[PDB]
């Protein structure tokens, strides 16, 4: 038997709002950023919910990571979540982004937000800029091109970019359900179905490959759009 | 739009099985106890998958708590998961139960598994026994009587049973969706619906009440049957 409650669209949305009502919210400045991102960007679908911002901030305050790595910055929403969750420690936040528009968008938001230089944006293809990083990170958040997740994790592990007691959090691993199977997101609009199906197929192979890597513990958590947790096996 | 993917019953079960297939499984000895629990208590109407077992183990290996408290032992499945995930740190596990058949099942299981060295089962009304505990716990798992959650958490916080860096995880907070409202679980078996509706009312009052406590950060995570994370507010 299963670990997922079945909801229709209306009710899933309603239960999300219930979680937000009954979870501490994100700071006002991050709400304003979120609303702005939604207003400014057509592809604003790539950005998390307010609840997910709460989850990122909770996670940071709980784990207290010393360095955070983020693969995929988009409009900086999640970077600013990590920044908020780490004010007491002034953790370093390294975030990688490929898209010139998102790069500009992010520096813009980061500028505006008043973040100090502990937030560092590195520009260029992540598969390459990842390889150049020094040291190790306590929390790594992966949410860039879905067809690149397998490569990213491989580089993280190979070069020891994940600290001993760190975790990798990979986002959107379900591809709305299409990671599991083509008939698993019947509600998707026709114009985005080819995209999610492509992602789903790549994330399926990604997920399978993780199970073949004897260095790590893997937990695919059925929350949000699917979150894979990865840690170094103790073992 | 929200943070929860909509799935019909069939598809939700398929996605659940996908998560199990693509997460490290629980040990053979724990699979055996899981089977035993489903047989001995076939009317349990209990959500406790292998995946949740994987989650509990991953969580303990990750967080490395020095001591674990759980309120609601049932058949000892979760206690044994905690045991597995804390093998190399020798963590103390204190579990509270009041049902005589559950106490019986758990003692038999704990003896068969050989986990008595560091699993301590405390018998009696958890309301009262919880208050007798001393020290602090790094991880607290609450899954007992749902009308009790508010009183358990208040005792935990008032007596400082939660360590500074610890977390409380409260399970089944959604009551199958009925916490959010009576129309939120149309798939549910009507023979258990009065029961879960009653739980849902209590858990709604519980969730609202958590938001009024200035001492804590709260996140209601839409995973499994609803998991509330609680920590001390910084700080």
From TrEMBL, chains A, B:
One of its GO terms (molecular function) is O-methyltransferase activity. One of its GO terms (biological process) is methylation. Keywords: Methyltransferase, S-adenosyl-L-methionine, Transferase. S-adenosyl-L-methionine 2 binds at residues 48, 74, 97-98, 126-127. InterPro entries: Cation-dep_OMT (IPR050362), SAM-dependent_MTases_sf (IPR029063), SAM_O-MeTrfase (IPR002935). S-adenosyl-L-homocysteine binds at residues 48, 74, 97-98, 126-127, 145. S-adenosyl-L-methionine 1 binds at residues 48, 97-98, 126-127, 145. The keyword Methyltransferase applies. Pfam families: Methyltransf_3. PANTHER family: CAFFEOYL-COA O-METHYLTRANSFERASE 3-RELATED, O-METHYLTRANSFERASE-RELATED. Belongs to the class I-like SAM-binding methyltransferase superfamily. Cation-dependent O-methyltransferase family. This is Putative SAM-dependent O-methyltranferase.
């Amino acid at each position: 038997l299963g670990s997922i409650l079945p909801f229709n669209e209306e009710t899933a949305d309603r239960v999300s709002a219930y979680c937000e009502k009954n979870s501490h919210g994100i700071p006002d400045a991050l709400v304003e950023h979120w609303e702005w991102t939604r207003t400014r960007f057509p592809d604003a679908d790539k950005m998390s919910s307010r609840l997910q911002g709460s989850w990122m901030i909770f996670t940071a305050r709980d784990r207290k990571p010393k360095r955070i790595l983020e693969i995929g910055c988009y409009s900086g929403y999640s970077a600013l979540a990590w920044y908020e969750g780490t004010r007491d420690t002034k953790a370093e936040i390294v975030t990688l982004e490929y898209s010139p528009k998102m790069i500009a968008a992010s520096r813009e938001a980061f500028k505006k937000y008043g973040v100090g230089d502990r937030v560092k944006l590195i520009e260029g293809p992540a598969e390459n800029t990842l390889k150049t990083l020094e040291g190790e990170f306590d929390l790594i958040f992966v949410d860039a091109n879905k067809d690149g997740y397998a490569g990213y994790v491989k580089t993280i592990l190979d070069q020891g970019l994940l600290s001993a007691n760190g975790i990798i959090l990979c986002d959107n691993v379900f591809a709305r359900g299409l990671t599991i199977g083509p008939d698993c997101a019947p509600w998707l609009n026709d114009h985005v179905r080819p995209y999610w199906n492509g992602c789903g197929q790549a994330l399926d192979k990604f997920s399978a490959g993780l199970m073949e890597d004897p260095r790590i513990d893997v937990l695919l958590l059925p929350v949000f759009d699917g979150v894979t947790q990865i840690r170094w096996k103790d073992g």
